[PDB]
Amino acid sequence: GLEVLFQGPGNAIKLIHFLFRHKIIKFKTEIINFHEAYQQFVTIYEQYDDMVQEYLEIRTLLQLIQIKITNAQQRILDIEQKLSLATDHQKEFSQSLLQLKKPIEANLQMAEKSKAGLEEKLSGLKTRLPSCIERFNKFMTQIEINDIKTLIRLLGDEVADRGSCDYFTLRILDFLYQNQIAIKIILSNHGYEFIHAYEKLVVGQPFKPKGYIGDIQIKSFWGLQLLLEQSVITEEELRSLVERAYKPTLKIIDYSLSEDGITLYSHAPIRFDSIRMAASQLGVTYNDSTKEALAETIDQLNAQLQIYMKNNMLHLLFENNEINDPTNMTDEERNASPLIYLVWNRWNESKEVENARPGKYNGYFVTYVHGHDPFQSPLTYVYNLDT
Amino acid sequence: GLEVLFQGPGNAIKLIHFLFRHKIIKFKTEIINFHEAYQQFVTIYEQYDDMVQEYLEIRTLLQLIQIKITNAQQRILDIEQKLSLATDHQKEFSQSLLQLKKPIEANLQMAEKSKAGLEEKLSGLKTRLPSCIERFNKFMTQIEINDIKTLIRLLGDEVADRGSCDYFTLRILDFLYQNQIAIKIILSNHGYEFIHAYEKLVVGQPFKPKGYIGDIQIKSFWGLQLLLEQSVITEEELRSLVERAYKPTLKIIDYSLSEDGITLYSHAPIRFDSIRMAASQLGVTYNDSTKEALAETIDQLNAQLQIYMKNNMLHLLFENNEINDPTNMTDEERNASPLIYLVWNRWNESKEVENARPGKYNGYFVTYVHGHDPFQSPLTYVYNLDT
């Protein structure tokens, strides 16, 4: 079989860049100017990403301003409650209370005006959104599938914004799914953050800002919220997209078998013994005896990921506030939260020790392929994806 | 008239030390051994202060442990809610959930045992308390008033624990009040903290730990809470003590008139123009023309302090989270919260400028007496109390 590696799943331009480069997709021959259409997509994505950024900031500013308003209104009415109870001979006290109110009524006036200005910018954003999505939907009619026989493994970008799972990325993953492309995404810390945020959006009552948030600081949550709020997409539309084209691709760890070896695909560099630790946490009986046994254990890990995910319980696996440095977890911490180690670990010289990552085990070869990590192992059977 | 200066109002030993030294109080001649009775009071106070300290710590530890318990119980029952919904073929998922519960049930067991140990120490504290107060009440029967013709100004200690307003200090202030001693306390930041905490204790429903607290970190609040909880004193008893012997002594600023001058008593060193700023905040018409006018303005400031205090509104005067450094407030900040400046300001070379503190004004001399401050002004008419 033919296979390629990417980081991702986003951002949209990187993913499009990569799909063109490996001849997975191509412009339909009916397009008059390939370069012009390509540049239009870049512009569209840069326009959409700016709008989501502005929306997040406006929304952050409106949350803080409403705090300012509610605190001022409370303090004024508390003072008003006291004035109403004063006596006829406490005339200095009444004047004192008026003095105290005057700056609060000033701040309240100021905050109400800032809010109005922010709601002005927010409504202007919302008139620009539909045509931007309209232009993206047009771009999506201009491409067609090409090579359908190539498997895509997305090992996850190590930084947030560069691999972010915006709405465009989601629509591209659906395009590949509708065209029968085999896609596998190795779940990362950012992948978990995305799923966690998405579950908030598709549960009733529909999410209203604001709000328990908070954050939801990730940009991919905000753009979906913007699209839902402006009726660009429906909750049924979004659930459909995520359940059919994104969730069924997710793996904790992935593999491929050769005649006498196994290749292990992960997001972070990981020790071989991390797999057993994960099987323990997920209730899977760990079998190491043969490469087929190990593959069968991994399939069951991924089957359990789907169960936790279908039950909205991923946070139990991927959130542990007690861990000090998830990138350099202690052995006690590795046992405690194996899945956090799998997506956060960063390698260094101290971890490049014999038996960390054997190249031969229980009679079969082992090969390790993982997303980008600054440390460069000299082991010939370790593959460290570039950025 | 005869007048003396102290910091205070506490702590109890310092205040007792000071009252003996200035012959305000003395042992009754029926006491067989003055030194022995004195040492017993020191022991009693050291015993009581230790008990209040232990109580605060135990109470702080129990608040944190109850957080640990409630969070563990919630996480276990959330998982139990999920187990009850699993299917017959999700057998790895069930085992996974049990695995996840086991460390939480461990922490819950550990936290419940720590709580039991803390409640063990707390009950042992509570058996020692009544006899300690009993021994203090005995000491209070062993002294009598001496010189009744001396006015006591308490300018406030600059640090918390050294001038703290424990129950013993309160009882001593009542003793002086019942014996017709003229007492004036210049309100400090610590004085405000004390009043603020006390208002929590005497309002229904009676304060139950815990609780919105929080803190209430001041020790003087905790010892009163301990005494009330163990029925050593009643809310009516405590309200009586504070309303009759403490609150009527409180001044924002105090004065004394000579034939041609005024002396200004404050807790912190303050600029002369801070008085007008305070009159503005309290609704008092500021008159500066003569020393009698200024005295009359100050009497009205103090009358307004009593109104704010009788209405439980002191926090409006003495809490401003926007101020950056209350010890070095900007002029804009001084205008904003004059009373915060009056109790927090610390002097330095940059503030020792002509016209800051005139020694002659509108035809009368001015003299400044304030609580301890590291900076030592060479002005002959500024008196900086020692520690």
Residue numbers in the entry:
A (entry chain A), B (entry chain A): 24 to 410
Manuscript text:
The crystal structure reveals a two-domain structure comprising a metallophosphoesterase attached to an 85-Å-long α-helical hairpin forming a coiled-coil at its tip. Although WipA exhibits a serine/threonine phosphatase fold, it functions preferentially as a protein-tyrosine phosphatase (PTP), even though there are no structural similarities to the general PTP fold.
The protein, however, degraded into shorter fragments, the most prominent of which had a molecular mass of 46 kDa. Mass spectrometry analysis of this fragment yielded a sequence coverage that included amino acids at the N and C termini from residue 34 to residue 411. The first is between the tip of the α-helical hairpin of one molecule and the globular domain from a symmetry-related molecule and is observed in both the WipA411 and WipA435 structures (and interaction details in B).
